[PDB]
């Protein structure tokens, strides 16, 4: 059964071609997606000249009341000798227009030191890195319409990878074919985990966690779990950010979560808070704890390095996709593969073109 898999590659690799192309090339750009912004957008990464930082709830209230038709749901809370606190917002009137959407505050004086609107188109200073980063996984399509597409392209790319891994395991046309061929089993093996983590990153609840669950049990998120609750049971929101940060340090004591609280999260839709420990430069050591909006009780824990095989195999996908599992080498590594993939998806559509040139 040799040519059956050969046909199965040509039909797959070509459907994938320009999606995988766009996706991977932009992904290379995103290899330094934090770094690019700091170069492009240095106001957002100010110095914060001060001593004692004011409480996460304090910084929230600044933003919620200077912008009375907006609400803070995610915020990055720094250690005050560093980057400006990041508070992210959403309309209060459901589908209202807002001029700005993410806020940078000095964490010692809540005074705004930069604003941004998320993903306006290519605008070099500020909406570039967000736009590339949301175009990359969704080709900026209407909503999940196409988040699904790019995740599907991911699914075929992975399936095509473990076909190619079996099929290959123990001129203009002359040169394009030779370049493309040159990957070997080595390159097919590199491709496989970028595709797999792609599946994880776009269709986590839908494909990847249900498929892994056959091999080890994946507890769903608190977010998965409360999306599935009957709405009357959700309760009414009584906590605030400060009350959460207390509760998470109380719980962090108990579980031995070493790291410090850096992110705080609240979701309207399901009435719960999130306190996430550790910085974005070591995403493998980040933990999360989620608390009920009314009780303050612990709804779920995602303590890094802990859980079931399937669960920590999930939390490795985002570190694997971004190279961070291998440090700056790996980031450089991934920045390379996305270029390779671009090359592949091109050279491979060409050897279709010039094969089709005989019919011309
Ligand atoms: C990295 C390892 C890869 C290897 C070893 C590889 C190998 C090949 C080979 C040897 C062909 C020969 C064409 C033929 O025999 O008929 C081919 C065709 C092709 N491959 Fe790849 N491939 C790789 C990755 C990719 C990727 C990532 C894509 C797209 C993203 C891709 C897209 C294509 C396409 C479109 C063709 C079309 C040729 C046709 O229609 O006949 N390949 N592949
Ligand atoms: C060419 C292959 C790909 C490469 C090299 C690549 C690379 C990357 C990189 C480096 C990141 C950033 C990780 C980090 O910030 O730490 C990223 C983000 C992401 N990737 Fe990919 N990627 C590729 C393909 C895909 C595919 C095919 C999909 C889905 C079909 C996908 C979905 C995503 C998602 C959802 C994110 C998260 C970005 C965000 O938060 O907005 N990737 N990609
Ligand atoms: C053309 C598109 C192709 C799509 C291919 C991927 C579809 C995968 C579905 C496989 O079937 C699943 O079996 C899982 C059970 O083993 C269930 O997971 C559920 O049950 C698990 C525990 O059994 C937990 O992971 C979760 O609570 C939960 O997601 C889940 O309901 C069900 O769908
Ligand atoms: Zn980042
Ligand atoms: Zn930084």
PDB file of N, CA and C in Angstrom, residues 73-115:
ATOM      1  N   UNK A  73     -11.283  42.314  32.709  1.00  0.00           N
ATOM      2  CA  UNK A  73     -11.460  40.858  32.862  1.00  0.00           C
ATOM      3  C   UNK A  73     -10.142  40.102  32.937  1.00  0.00           C
ATOM      4  N   UNK A  74      -9.077  40.628  32.374  1.00  0.00           N
ATOM      5  CA  UNK A  74      -7.742  40.016  32.439  1.00  0.00           C
ATOM      6  C   UNK A  74      -6.802  41.156  32.732  1.00  0.00           C
ATOM      7  N   UNK A  75      -5.815  40.920  33.553  1.00  0.00           N
ATOM      8  CA  UNK A  75      -4.851  41.984  33.816  1.00  0.00           C
ATOM      9  C   UNK A  75      -3.546  41.268  34.082  1.00  0.00           C
ATOM     10  N   UNK A  76      -2.422  41.867  33.727  1.00  0.00           N
ATOM     11  CA  UNK A  76      -1.073  41.329  34.001  1.00  0.00           C
ATOM     12  C   UNK A  76      -0.604  42.232  35.118  1.00  0.00           C
ATOM     13  N   UNK A  77      -0.299  41.658  36.266  1.00  0.00           N
ATOM     14  CA  UNK A  77       0.104  42.439  37.438  1.00  0.00           C
ATOM     15  C   UNK A  77       1.583  42.192  37.660  1.00  0.00           C
ATOM     16  N   UNK A  78       2.425  43.193  37.415  1.00  0.00           N
ATOM     17  CA  UNK A  78       3.877  43.035  37.524  1.00  0.00           C
ATOM     18  C   UNK A  78       4.404  43.258  38.942  1.00  0.00           C
ATOM     19  N   UNK A  79       5.726  43.254  39.112  1.00  0.00           N
ATOM     20  CA  UNK A  79       6.306  43.386  40.465  1.00  0.00           C
ATOM     21  C   UNK A  79       6.779  44.804  40.755  1.00  0.00           C
ATOM     22  N   UNK A  80       6.394  45.749  39.905  1.00  0.00           N
ATOM     23  CA  UNK A  80       6.536  47.219  40.041  1.00  0.00           C
ATOM     24  C   UNK A  80       7.915  47.748  39.705  1.00  0.00           C
ATOM     25  N   UNK A  81       8.866  46.893  39.443  1.00  0.00           N
ATOM     26  CA  UNK A  81      10.160  47.437  39.058  1.00  0.00           C
ATOM     27  C   UNK A  81      10.231  47.139  37.604  1.00  0.00           C
ATOM     28  N   UNK A  82       9.071  46.860  37.022  1.00  0.00           N
ATOM     29  CA  UNK A  82       9.178  46.454  35.628  1.00  0.00           C
ATOM     30  C   UNK A  82       8.081  46.991  34.735  1.00  0.00           C
ATOM     31  N   UNK A  83       7.687  46.134  33.791  1.00  0.00           N
ATOM     32  CA  UNK A  83       6.772  46.452  32.695  1.00  0.00           C
ATOM     33  C   UNK A  83       5.485  47.053  33.265  1.00  0.00           C
ATOM     34  N   UNK A  84       4.784  47.867  32.491  1.00  0.00           N
ATOM     35  CA  UNK A  84       3.522  48.429  32.954  1.00  0.00           C
ATOM     36  C   UNK A  84       2.452  47.367  33.067  1.00  0.00           C
ATOM     37  N   UNK A  85       1.654  47.423  34.122  1.00  0.00           N
ATOM     38  CA  UNK A  85       0.536  46.481  34.271  1.00  0.00           C
ATOM     39  C   UNK A  85      -0.400  46.552  33.066  1.00  0.00           C
ATOM     40  N   UNK A  86      -0.822  45.391  32.588  1.00  0.00           N
ATOM     41  CA  UNK A  86      -1.675  45.297  31.400  1.00  0.00           C
ATOM     42  C   UNK A  86      -3.089  44.979  31.854  1.00  0.00           C
ATOM     43  N   UNK A  87      -4.033  45.875  31.615  1.00  0.00           N
ATOM     44  CA  UNK A  87      -5.435  45.583  31.933  1.00  0.00           C
ATOM     45  C   UNK A  87      -6.239  45.494  30.643  1.00  0.00           C
ATOM     46  N   UNK A  88      -6.913  44.376  30.423  1.00  0.00           N
ATOM     47  CA  UNK A  88      -7.693  44.189  29.199  1.00  0.00           C
ATOM     48  C   UNK A  88      -9.180  44.278  29.515  1.00  0.00           C
ATOM     49  N   UNK A  89      -9.932  44.830  28.566  1.00  0.00           N
ATOM     50  CA  UNK A  89     -11.274  45.383  28.791  1.00  0.00           C
ATOM     51  C   UNK A  89     -12.268  44.801  27.811  1.00  0.00           C
ATOM     52  N   UNK A  90     -13.554  44.992  28.097  1.00  0.00           N
ATOM     53  CA  UNK A  90     -14.637  44.586  27.179  1.00  0.00           C
ATOM     54  C   UNK A  90     -15.826  45.542  27.334  1.00  0.00           C
ATOM     55  N   UNK A  91     -16.634  45.813  26.293  1.00  0.00           N
ATOM     56  CA  UNK A  91     -17.819  46.655  26.498  1.00  0.00           C
ATOM     57  C   UNK A  91     -18.770  46.151  27.587  1.00  0.00           C
ATOM     58  N   UNK A  92     -19.405  47.098  28.268  1.00  0.00           N
ATOM     59  CA  UNK A  92     -20.475  46.841  29.249  1.00  0.00           C
ATOM     60  C   UNK A  92     -21.832  46.643  28.571  1.00  0.00           C
ATOM     61  N   UNK A  93     -22.018  47.245  27.405  1.00  0.00           N
ATOM     62  CA  UNK A  93     -23.335  47.192  26.736  1.00  0.00           C
ATOM     63  C   UNK A  93     -23.344  46.120  25.663  1.00  0.00           C
ATOM     64  N   UNK A  94     -22.619  45.036  25.895  1.00  0.00           N
ATOM     65  CA  UNK A  94     -22.523  43.832  25.048  1.00  0.00           C
ATOM     66  C   UNK A  94     -21.810  44.056  23.712  1.00  0.00           C
ATOM     67  N   UNK A  95     -22.333  44.899  22.831  1.00  0.00           N
ATOM     68  CA  UNK A  95     -21.724  45.008  21.496  1.00  0.00           C
ATOM     69  C   UNK A  95     -21.483  46.433  21.128  1.00  0.00           C
ATOM     70  N   UNK A  96     -21.046  47.181  22.103  1.00  0.00           N
ATOM     71  CA  UNK A  96     -20.760  48.602  21.983  1.00  0.00           C
ATOM     72  C   UNK A  96     -19.394  48.804  21.322  1.00  0.00           C
ATOM     73  N   UNK A  97     -19.238  49.948  20.665  1.00  0.00           N
ATOM     74  CA  UNK A  97     -17.954  50.371  20.100  1.00  0.00           C
ATOM     75  C   UNK A  97     -17.149  51.049  21.199  1.00  0.00           C
ATOM     76  N   UNK A  98     -15.841  50.803  21.208  1.00  0.00           N
ATOM     77  CA  UNK A  98     -14.913  51.452  22.154  1.00  0.00           C
ATOM     78  C   UNK A  98     -13.650  51.860  21.408  1.00  0.00           C
ATOM     79  N   UNK A  99     -13.123  53.032  21.743  1.00  0.00           N
ATOM     80  CA  UNK A  99     -11.997  53.615  20.994  1.00  0.00           C
ATOM     81  C   UNK A  99     -10.695  52.891  21.335  1.00  0.00           C
ATOM     82  N   UNK A 100     -10.596  52.381  22.554  1.00  0.00           N
ATOM     83  CA  UNK A 100      -9.417  51.662  23.055  1.00  0.00           C
ATOM     84  C   UNK A 100      -9.893  50.540  23.972  1.00  0.00           C
ATOM     85  N   UNK A 101      -9.026  49.533  24.119  1.00  0.00           N
ATOM     86  CA  UNK A 101      -9.475  48.219  24.596  1.00  0.00           C
ATOM     87  C   UNK A 101      -8.488  47.502  25.519  1.00  0.00           C
ATOM     88  N   UNK A 102      -7.227  47.921  25.569  1.00  0.00           N
ATOM     89  CA  UNK A 102      -6.187  47.365  26.454  1.00  0.00           C
ATOM     90  C   UNK A 102      -5.418  48.524  27.065  1.00  0.00           C
ATOM     91  N   UNK A 103      -5.163  48.489  28.364  1.00  0.00           N
ATOM     92  CA  UNK A 103      -4.617  49.667  29.058  1.00  0.00           C
ATOM     93  C   UNK A 103      -3.334  49.339  29.814  1.00  0.00           C
ATOM     94  N   UNK A 104      -2.366  50.228  29.704  1.00  0.00           N
ATOM     95  CA  UNK A 104      -1.087  50.060  30.384  1.00  0.00           C
ATOM     96  C   UNK A 104      -1.030  51.102  31.477  1.00  0.00           C
ATOM     97  N   UNK A 105      -0.877  50.634  32.701  1.00  0.00           N
ATOM     98  CA  UNK A 105      -0.842  51.499  33.879  1.00  0.00           C
ATOM     99  C   UNK A 105       0.494  51.346  34.585  1.00  0.00           C
ATOM    100  N   UNK A 106       1.097  52.467  34.995  1.00  0.00           N
ATOM    101  CA  UNK A 106       2.135  52.409  36.035  1.00  0.00           C
ATOM    102  C   UNK A 106       1.513  51.755  37.263  1.00  0.00           C
ATOM    103  N   UNK A 107       2.138  50.698  37.797  1.00  0.00           N
ATOM    104  CA  UNK A 107       1.559  49.974  38.923  1.00  0.00           C
ATOM    105  C   UNK A 107       1.841  50.664  40.247  1.00  0.00           C
ATOM    106  N   UNK A 108       2.567  51.787  40.245  1.00  0.00           N
ATOM    107  CA  UNK A 108       2.795  52.568  41.480  1.00  0.00           C
ATOM    108  C   UNK A 108       1.905  53.807  41.531  1.00  0.00           C
ATOM    109  N   UNK A 109       1.821  54.554  40.442  1.00  0.00           N
ATOM    110  CA  UNK A 109       0.771  55.555  40.261  1.00  0.00           C
ATOM    111  C   UNK A 109      -0.147  55.034  39.177  1.00  0.00           C
ATOM    112  N   UNK A 110      -1.437  54.892  39.405  1.00  0.00           N
ATOM    113  CA  UNK A 110      -2.303  54.289  38.372  1.00  0.00           C
ATOM    114  C   UNK A 110      -2.262  55.690  37.800  1.00  0.00           C
ATOM    115  N   UNK A 111      -1.560  55.854  36.704  1.00  0.00           N
ATOM    116  CA  UNK A 111      -1.657  56.815  35.610  1.00  0.00           C
ATOM    117  C   UNK A 111      -1.353  56.048  34.363  1.00  0.00           C
ATOM    118  N   UNK A 112      -2.248  56.129  33.417  1.00  0.00           N
ATOM    119  CA  UNK A 112      -2.155  55.505  32.096  1.00  0.00           C
ATOM    120  C   UNK A 112      -0.843  55.886  31.409  1.00  0.00           C
ATOM    121  N   UNK A 113      -0.097  54.898  30.918  1.00  0.00           N
ATOM    122  CA  UNK A 113       1.146  55.159  30.165  1.00  0.00           C
ATOM    123  C   UNK A 113       1.077  54.425  28.818  1.00  0.00           C
ATOM    124  N   UNK A 114      -0.140  54.223  28.308  1.00  0.00           N
ATOM    125  CA  UNK A 114      -0.336  53.717  26.949  1.00  0.00           C
ATOM    126  C   UNK A 114      -1.663  53.007  26.774  1.00  0.00           C
ATOM    127  N   UNK A 115      -2.239  53.118  25.588  1.00  0.00           N
ATOM    128  CA  UNK A 115      -3.492  52.440  25.267  1.00  0.00           C
ATOM    129  C   UNK A 115      -3.357  51.822  23.907  1.00  0.00           C
TER     130      UNK A 115
END
